[PDB]
Design a protein around this nucleic acid. Structure first.
Length: 276
DNA sequence: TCGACGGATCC
DNA sequence: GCTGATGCGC
DNA sequence: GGATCCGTCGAGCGCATCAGC
């Protein structure tokens, strides 16, 4: 069935106005996304921070319209060292962060430009493009090694400052989070090993799924639809993109949106509203 | 990855 | 420089 | 014999390299 995201709640549950707006988006080819007018949608959305995933573009090939963003002038890019036109994440912010770094500390895992860590006055923002288990699970065993490393990285960090993780985590945590959950239990993104890894992430760090903490039984709410077979029109889709919060940030949580209608990629944007 | 299939089974 | 085939990863 | 849980083949996009010109 079709899905219309509820309207933007811009006040904290104790009445504090939201002061920070973070948008995350797997653009699945930044240069295609831009040509398909993605930057227009971002200017309308006007976030304080934009996290981009699956850019498939090296820094020196970034189009010019990316610089002519005034309200997002601090930009940091991480692409892989070996594979051109593969993976790659971006982080653009209105206000310069205190610290930026790339990778999660391992070396088997910081070779693909999947993670940017941005530190701000009150919170630490991480953005991820989690490795996909691939067609026929060819990379699932790698994915599980990744998960454990990422998990330890986040914990060994969420214990100075509270943690905002956002981006494409390439798992539908529960059957609620996809349209065909049982035609998909041997497909990448709904394997038991992937799913339990997500829960491991939620318990170990710990974190909270912003969207599911505000809508614990809302169905049909996906961020990803395959280009194939008009999956997007039929709203047959998956929820792969998250905002995950430190517990001490739920008091500050105003809303976690799924921007179903923005086009330009096989994913749609997600937007977080915090009060700080 | 999804939505066609066949094939096999449970009342 | 441009197009189109072929390959690859989702 | 309607409602299953299966295994299979069909399914769009973007980007890189390469060859031709």
């Amino acid at each position: 069935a079709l899905y219309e995201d509820p309207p933007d709640q811009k006040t904290s549950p104790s009445g504090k106005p939201a002061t920070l707006k973070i948008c995350s988006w797997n653009v699945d080819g930044l240069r295609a996304w831009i040509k398909k007018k993605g930057l227009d949608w971002v200017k309308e959305e006007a976030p304080d921070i934009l996290c981009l995933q699956e850019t498939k573009c090296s820094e020196n090939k970034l189009p010019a319209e990316l610089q002519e963003l005034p309200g997002l002038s601090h930009q940091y890019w991480s692409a892989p060292s070996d594979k051109e036109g593969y993976s790659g994440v971006g982080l653009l912010s209105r206000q310069a962060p205190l610290k930026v770094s790339y990778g999660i500390g391992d070396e088997e895992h910081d070779q693909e430009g999947r993670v940017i860590v941005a530190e701000f006055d009150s919170f630490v923002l991480v953005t991820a493009y989690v490795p996909n288990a691939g067609r026929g699970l060819v990379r699932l065993e790698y994915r599980q090694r990744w998960d454990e490393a990422f998990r330890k990285f986040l914990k060994g960090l969420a214990s100075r400052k509270p943690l905002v993780l956002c981006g494409d985590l390439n798992v539908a945590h529960e059957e609620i989070d996809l349209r065909n959950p049982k035609g998909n239990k041997k497909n990448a993104g709904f394997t038991p090993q992937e799913r339990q890894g997500f829960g491991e992430l939620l318990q170990a760090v710990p974190l909270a799924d912003s969207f599911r903490h505000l809508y614990p039984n809302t169905p049909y709410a996906y961020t990803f639809w395959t280009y194939m077979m008009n999956a997007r029109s039929k709203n047959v889709g998956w929820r792969l993109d998250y905002f995950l919060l430190s517990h001490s940030l739920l008091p500050a949580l105003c809303d976690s949106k799924i921007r179903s209608k923005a086009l330009g990629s096989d994913h749609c944007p997600i937007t977080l509203y915090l009060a700080l």
